[PDB]
Amino acid sequence: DELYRQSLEIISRYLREQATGAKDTKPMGRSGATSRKALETLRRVGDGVQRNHETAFQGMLRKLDIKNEDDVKSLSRVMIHVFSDGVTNWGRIVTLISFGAFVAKHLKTINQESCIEPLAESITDVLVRTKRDWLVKQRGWDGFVEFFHV
């Protein structure tokens, strides 16, 4: 599943980098050129989403109890419901991933750096399960990068 693999690469890298501060230097798989600009776009736009929605993000983070990987999987119930309701557009997707980064940074501060990879898998699973046809119609990550271009 190449859309899943590329999406997990992009989402995983962004959440880990936000949480640790460090860029992951390891090589990308294929479509790495698109994955790179998608990461550039996340750093640029995603960082501002977290600032601009800080109150709402902190409020949702308070409502989440994440003690183990079973609780990461339980979150996916909230993620599917809130993300499935409403209009589909690239703003929804960048919000989904930016709140992922906001949660991963918290998970690192509480010594749960380990839940970050499962969190990224859940986010990617929800994104592709709910929006695969729309994502393909929009040229996937090439569409994401074009949308936020400039």
Ligand X SMILES: Cc1n[nH]c(C)c1-c1cccc2c(CCCOc3cccc4ccccc34)c(C(=O)O)[nH]c12
- What's the closest the beta carbon of residue 3 comes to ligand X, in angstroms? 19
- Is there binding between residue 79 and ligand X (CB under 6 A)? yes
* Nearest of 119, 144, 114, 129 to residue 42 by alpha carbon: 144
The footprint of ligand X on this chain (CB under 6 A) covers a number of residues equal to 25
SS3 137: helix
Tell me: does residue 135 bind ligand X (CB under 6 A): no
Helix H or strand E segment including 9: helix 2-20
How far CA 22 is from CA of 8, 19, 45, in Å, comes to: 18, 8, 18
Give the nearest distance from C-beta 67 to ligand X in angstroms: 15
**CB 63, min distance to ligand X, A:** 8
Is residue 92 a contact residue for ligand X (CB under 6 A)? yes
- Residues in touch with ligand X (CB under 6 A): 45, 49, 52-53, 56-57, 60, 75, 78-79, 82-83, 87, 89-92, 94-96, 99-100, 103, 123, 148
